[PDB]
Short mmCIF file of C-alpha atoms in Angstrom, two decimals:
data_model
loop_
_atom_site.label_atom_id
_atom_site.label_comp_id
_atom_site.label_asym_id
_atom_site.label_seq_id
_atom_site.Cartn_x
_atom_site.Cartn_y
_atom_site.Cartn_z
CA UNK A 156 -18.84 -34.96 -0.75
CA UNK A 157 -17.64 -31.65 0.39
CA UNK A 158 -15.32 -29.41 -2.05
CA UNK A 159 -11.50 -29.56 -0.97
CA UNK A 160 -8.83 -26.82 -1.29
CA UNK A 161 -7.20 -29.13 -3.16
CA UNK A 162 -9.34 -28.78 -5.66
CA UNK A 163 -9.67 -25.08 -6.04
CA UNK A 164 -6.01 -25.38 -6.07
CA UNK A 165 -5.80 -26.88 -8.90
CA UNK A 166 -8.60 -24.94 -10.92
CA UNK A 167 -6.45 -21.56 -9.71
CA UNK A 168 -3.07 -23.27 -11.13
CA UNK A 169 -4.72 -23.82 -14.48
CA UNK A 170 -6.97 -20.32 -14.69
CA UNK A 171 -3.71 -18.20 -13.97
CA UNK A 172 -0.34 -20.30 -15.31
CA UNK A 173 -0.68 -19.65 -19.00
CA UNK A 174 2.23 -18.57 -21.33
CA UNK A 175 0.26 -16.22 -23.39
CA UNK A 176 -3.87 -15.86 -24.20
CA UNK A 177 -5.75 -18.65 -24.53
CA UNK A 178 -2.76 -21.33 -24.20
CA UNK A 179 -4.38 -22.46 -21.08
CA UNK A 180 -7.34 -23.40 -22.56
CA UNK A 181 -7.13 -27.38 -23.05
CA UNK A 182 -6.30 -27.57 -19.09
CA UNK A 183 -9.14 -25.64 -17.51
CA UNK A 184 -11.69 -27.28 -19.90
CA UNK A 185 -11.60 -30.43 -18.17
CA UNK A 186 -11.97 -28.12 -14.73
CA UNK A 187 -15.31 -26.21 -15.48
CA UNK A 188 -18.60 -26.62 -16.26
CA UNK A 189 -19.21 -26.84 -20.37
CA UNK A 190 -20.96 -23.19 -20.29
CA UNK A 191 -18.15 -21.93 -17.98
CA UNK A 192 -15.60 -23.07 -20.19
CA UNK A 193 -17.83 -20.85 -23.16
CA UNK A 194 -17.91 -17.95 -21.10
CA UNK A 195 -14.37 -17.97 -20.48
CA UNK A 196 -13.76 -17.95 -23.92
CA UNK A 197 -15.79 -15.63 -24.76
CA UNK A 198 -13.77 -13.13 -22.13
CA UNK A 199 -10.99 -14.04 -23.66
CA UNK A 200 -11.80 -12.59 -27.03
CA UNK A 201 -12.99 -8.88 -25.27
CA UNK A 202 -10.87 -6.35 -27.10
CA UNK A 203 -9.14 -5.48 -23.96
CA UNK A 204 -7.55 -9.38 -23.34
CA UNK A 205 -6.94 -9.77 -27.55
CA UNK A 206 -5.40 -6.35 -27.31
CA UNK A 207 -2.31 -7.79 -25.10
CA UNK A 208 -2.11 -11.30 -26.45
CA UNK A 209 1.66 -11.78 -27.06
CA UNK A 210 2.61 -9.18 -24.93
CA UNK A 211 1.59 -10.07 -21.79
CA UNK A 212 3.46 -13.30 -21.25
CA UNK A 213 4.45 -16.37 -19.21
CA UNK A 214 1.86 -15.63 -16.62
CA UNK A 215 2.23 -17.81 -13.35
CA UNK A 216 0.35 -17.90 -9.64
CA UNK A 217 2.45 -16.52 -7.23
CA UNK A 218 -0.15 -16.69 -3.92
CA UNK A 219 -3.90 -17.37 -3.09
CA UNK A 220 -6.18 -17.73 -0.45
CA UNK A 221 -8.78 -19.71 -0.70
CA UNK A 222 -12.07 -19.14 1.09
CA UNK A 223 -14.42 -21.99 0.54
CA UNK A 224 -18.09 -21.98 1.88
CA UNK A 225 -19.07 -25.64 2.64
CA UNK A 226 -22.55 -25.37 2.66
CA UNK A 227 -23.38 -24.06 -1.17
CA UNK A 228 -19.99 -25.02 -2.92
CA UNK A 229 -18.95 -21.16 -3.54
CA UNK A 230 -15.40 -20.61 -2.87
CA UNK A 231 -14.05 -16.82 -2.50
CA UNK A 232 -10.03 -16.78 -3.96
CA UNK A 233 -7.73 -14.09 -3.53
CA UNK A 234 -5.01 -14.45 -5.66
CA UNK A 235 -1.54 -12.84 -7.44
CA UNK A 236 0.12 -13.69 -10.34
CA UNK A 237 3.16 -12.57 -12.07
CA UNK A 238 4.06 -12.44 -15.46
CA UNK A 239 6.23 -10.61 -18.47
CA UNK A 240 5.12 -7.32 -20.46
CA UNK A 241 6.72 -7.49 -23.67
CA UNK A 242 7.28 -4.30 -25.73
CA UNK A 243 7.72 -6.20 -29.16
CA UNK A 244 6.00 -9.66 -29.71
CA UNK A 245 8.04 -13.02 -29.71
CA UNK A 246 10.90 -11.10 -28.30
CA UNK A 247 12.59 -10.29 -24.62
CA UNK A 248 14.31 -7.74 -25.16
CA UNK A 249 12.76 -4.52 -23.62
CA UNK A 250 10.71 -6.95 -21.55
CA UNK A 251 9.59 -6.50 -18.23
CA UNK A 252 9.73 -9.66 -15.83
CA UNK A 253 7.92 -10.58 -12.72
CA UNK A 254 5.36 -7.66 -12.78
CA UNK A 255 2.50 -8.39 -9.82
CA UNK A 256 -0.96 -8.57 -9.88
CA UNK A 257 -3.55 -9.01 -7.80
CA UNK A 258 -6.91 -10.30 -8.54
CA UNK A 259 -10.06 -11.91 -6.08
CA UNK A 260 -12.82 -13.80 -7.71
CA UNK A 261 -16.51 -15.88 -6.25
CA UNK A 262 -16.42 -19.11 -7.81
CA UNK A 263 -19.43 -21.18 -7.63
CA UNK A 264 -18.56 -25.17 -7.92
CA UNK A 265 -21.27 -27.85 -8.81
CA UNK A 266 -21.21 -31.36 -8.53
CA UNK A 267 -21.04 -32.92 -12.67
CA UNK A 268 -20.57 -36.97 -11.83
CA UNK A 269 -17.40 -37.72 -9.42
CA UNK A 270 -15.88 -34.03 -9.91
CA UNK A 271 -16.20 -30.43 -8.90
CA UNK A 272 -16.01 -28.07 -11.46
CA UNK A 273 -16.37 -24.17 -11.37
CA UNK A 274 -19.70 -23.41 -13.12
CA UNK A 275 -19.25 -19.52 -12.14
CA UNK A 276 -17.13 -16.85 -12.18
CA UNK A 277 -17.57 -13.16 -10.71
CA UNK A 278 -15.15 -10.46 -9.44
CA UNK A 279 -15.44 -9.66 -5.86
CA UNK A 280 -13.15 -6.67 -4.25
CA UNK A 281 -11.94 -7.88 -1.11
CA UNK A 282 -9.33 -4.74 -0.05
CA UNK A 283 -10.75 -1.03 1.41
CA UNK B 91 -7.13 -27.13 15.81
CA UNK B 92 -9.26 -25.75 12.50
CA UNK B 93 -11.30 -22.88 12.56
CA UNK B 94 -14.90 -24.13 12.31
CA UNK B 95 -17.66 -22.74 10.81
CA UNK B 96 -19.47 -23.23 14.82
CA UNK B 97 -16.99 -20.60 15.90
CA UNK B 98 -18.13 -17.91 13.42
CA UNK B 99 -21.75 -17.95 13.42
CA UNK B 100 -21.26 -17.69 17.31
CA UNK B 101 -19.65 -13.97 17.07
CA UNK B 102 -21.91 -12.95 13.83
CA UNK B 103 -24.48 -14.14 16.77
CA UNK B 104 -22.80 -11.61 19.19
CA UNK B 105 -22.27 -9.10 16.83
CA UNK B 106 -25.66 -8.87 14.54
CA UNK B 107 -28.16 -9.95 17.27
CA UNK B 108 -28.42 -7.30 19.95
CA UNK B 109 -31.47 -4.70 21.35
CA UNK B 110 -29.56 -1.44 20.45
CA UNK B 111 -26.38 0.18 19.79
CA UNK B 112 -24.03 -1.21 22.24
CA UNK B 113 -26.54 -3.74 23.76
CA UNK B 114 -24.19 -6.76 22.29
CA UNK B 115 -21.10 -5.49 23.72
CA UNK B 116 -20.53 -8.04 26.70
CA UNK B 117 -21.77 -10.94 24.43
CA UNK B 118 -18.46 -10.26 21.72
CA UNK B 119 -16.11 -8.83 23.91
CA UNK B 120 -14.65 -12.50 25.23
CA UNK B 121 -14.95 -13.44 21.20
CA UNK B 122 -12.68 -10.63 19.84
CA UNK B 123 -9.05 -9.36 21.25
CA UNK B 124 -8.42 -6.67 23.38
CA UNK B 125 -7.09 -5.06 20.59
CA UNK B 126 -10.23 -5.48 18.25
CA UNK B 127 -12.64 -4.87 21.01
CA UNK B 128 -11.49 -1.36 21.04
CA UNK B 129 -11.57 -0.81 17.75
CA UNK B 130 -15.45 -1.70 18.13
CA UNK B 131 -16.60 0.03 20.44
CA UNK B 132 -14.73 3.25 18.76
CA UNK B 133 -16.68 2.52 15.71
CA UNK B 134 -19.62 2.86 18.03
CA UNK B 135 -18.97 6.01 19.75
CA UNK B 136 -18.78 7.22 16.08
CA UNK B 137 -21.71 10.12 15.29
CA UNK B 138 -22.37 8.30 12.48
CA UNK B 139 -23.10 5.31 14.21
CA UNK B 140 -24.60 7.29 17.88
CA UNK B 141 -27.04 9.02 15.70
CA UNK B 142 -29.34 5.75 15.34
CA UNK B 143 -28.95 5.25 18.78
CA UNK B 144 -32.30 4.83 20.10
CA UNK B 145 -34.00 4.22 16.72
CA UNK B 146 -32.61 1.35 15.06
CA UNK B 147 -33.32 -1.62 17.27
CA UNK B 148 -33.92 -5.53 17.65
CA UNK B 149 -31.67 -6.28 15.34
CA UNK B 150 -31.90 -9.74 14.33
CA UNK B 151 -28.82 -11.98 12.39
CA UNK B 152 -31.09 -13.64 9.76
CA UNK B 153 -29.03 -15.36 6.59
CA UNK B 154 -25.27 -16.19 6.34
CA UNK B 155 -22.67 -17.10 4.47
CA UNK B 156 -19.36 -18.26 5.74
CA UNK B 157 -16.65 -18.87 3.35
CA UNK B 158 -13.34 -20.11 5.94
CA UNK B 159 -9.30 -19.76 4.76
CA UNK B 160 -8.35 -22.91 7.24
CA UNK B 161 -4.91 -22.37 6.33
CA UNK B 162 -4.70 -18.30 7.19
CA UNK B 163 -7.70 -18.49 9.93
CA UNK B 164 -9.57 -15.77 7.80
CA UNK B 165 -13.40 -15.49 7.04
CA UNK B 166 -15.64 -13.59 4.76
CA UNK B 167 -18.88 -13.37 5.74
CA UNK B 168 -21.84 -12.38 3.83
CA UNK B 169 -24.79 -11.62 6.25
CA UNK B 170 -27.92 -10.11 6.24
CA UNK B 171 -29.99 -8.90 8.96
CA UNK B 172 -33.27 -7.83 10.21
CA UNK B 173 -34.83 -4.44 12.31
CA UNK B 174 -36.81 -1.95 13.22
CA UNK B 175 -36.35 1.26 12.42
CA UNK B 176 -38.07 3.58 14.60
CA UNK B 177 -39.85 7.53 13.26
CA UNK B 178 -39.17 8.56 16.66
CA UNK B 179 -36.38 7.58 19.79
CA UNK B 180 -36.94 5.82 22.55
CA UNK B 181 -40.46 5.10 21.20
CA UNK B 182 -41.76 2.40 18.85
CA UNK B 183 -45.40 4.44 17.70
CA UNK B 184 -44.90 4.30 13.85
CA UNK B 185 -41.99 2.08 13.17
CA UNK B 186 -41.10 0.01 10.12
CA UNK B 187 -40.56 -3.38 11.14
CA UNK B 188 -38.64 -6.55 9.80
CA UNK B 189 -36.60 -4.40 7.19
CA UNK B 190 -33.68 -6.20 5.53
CA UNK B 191 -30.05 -5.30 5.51
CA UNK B 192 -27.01 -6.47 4.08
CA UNK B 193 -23.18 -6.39 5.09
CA UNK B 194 -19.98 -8.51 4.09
CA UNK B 195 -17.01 -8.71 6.00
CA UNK B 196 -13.33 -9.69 6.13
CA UNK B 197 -13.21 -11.26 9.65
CA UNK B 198 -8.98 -12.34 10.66
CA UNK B 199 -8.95 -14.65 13.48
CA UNK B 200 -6.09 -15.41 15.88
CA UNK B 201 -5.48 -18.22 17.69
CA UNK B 202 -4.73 -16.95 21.49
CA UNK B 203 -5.33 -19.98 23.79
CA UNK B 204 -7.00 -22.86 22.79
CA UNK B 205 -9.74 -20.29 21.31
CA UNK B 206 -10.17 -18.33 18.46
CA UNK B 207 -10.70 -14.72 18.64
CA UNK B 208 -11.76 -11.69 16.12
CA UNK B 209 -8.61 -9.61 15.82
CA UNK B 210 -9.29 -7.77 12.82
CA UNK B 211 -12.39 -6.91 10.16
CA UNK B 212 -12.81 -4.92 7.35
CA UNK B 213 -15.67 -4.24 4.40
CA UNK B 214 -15.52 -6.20 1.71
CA UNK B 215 -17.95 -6.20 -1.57
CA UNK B 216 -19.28 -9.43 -2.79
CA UNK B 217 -22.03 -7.97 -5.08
CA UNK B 218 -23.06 -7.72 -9.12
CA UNK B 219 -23.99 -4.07 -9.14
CA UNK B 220 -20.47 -2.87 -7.62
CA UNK B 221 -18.31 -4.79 -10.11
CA UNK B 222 -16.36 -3.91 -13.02
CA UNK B 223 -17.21 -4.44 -16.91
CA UNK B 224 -16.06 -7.70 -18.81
CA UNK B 225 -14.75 -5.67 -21.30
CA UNK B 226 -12.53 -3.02 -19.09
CA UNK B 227 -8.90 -2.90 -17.63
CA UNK B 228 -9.01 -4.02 -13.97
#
């Protein structure tokens, strides 16, 4: 009926816990919308995400606040995450742990048989 | 208990709806803090803001969107509104009427009593236009 916390919860644990590019894939898929799930994909393969893939790293959510808006399913998240910056690939030494980030998106949730799932995505700036 | 979405639109209520500059004032001051309330009316006293004094008025709260943190008592809001905007002050010959306006806000809420109250907000930007490139480092 109306769209939990719990369940942006668990759409946030799978969109930012990833051990490297893409490796994340198979458990946000069942999360999102099919063309979501495409367009996420397709992000993923921008030259600037390839560019890092193996050396940005074990990637986990650290906080996030979850706005949600009851009456149109769109759900405001502001969110950090932490993960490792490698300097050579497949290796930790020179590596740089626990490095912060911040990040606040507008997800828009519909209603696909008995789940939620996030059918957009858009970058919102929440800070002054 | 919860902050409810009742106890939102009731200040944007208070603090889009009002005659003129300043009009509002005794309809949000027992729905902010001391503190915040303040801050307000210091943000009114502003040039900026004292300029269109007099020629920006009924100023109507027309669509919202509330999005609620329940767990940190914090809002966004994305609002638009509705006024006239008056050639000349004081005097309503050759005004535009019903002209839209936009704003989104960070609105914090504290729990002082059994009521919530508006201790802090901020500008936020919820919009397409403002936003980065897919293909650019955040």
């Amino acid at each position: 009926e109306e769209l939990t916390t719990s369940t942006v919860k668990k759409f946030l644990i799978a969109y930012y816990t990833k051990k490297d590019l893409g490796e994340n894939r198979n458990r946000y898929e069942p999360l999102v919308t099919s063309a979501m799930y495409n367009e996420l994909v397709n992000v993923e393969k921008q030259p600037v995400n390839q560019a890092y893939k193996g050396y940005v790293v074990n990637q986990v959510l650290d906080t996030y606040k979850i706005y949600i808006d009851t009456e149109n399913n769109e759900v405001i998240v502001d969110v950090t995450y932490k993960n490792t910056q490698r300097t050579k690939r497949n290796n930790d030494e020179g590596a740089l742990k626990n490095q912060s980030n911040q990040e606040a998106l507008k997800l828009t949730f519909v209603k696909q048989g008995a789940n939620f799932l996030v059918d957009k995505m858009a970058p919102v700036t929440l800070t002054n």
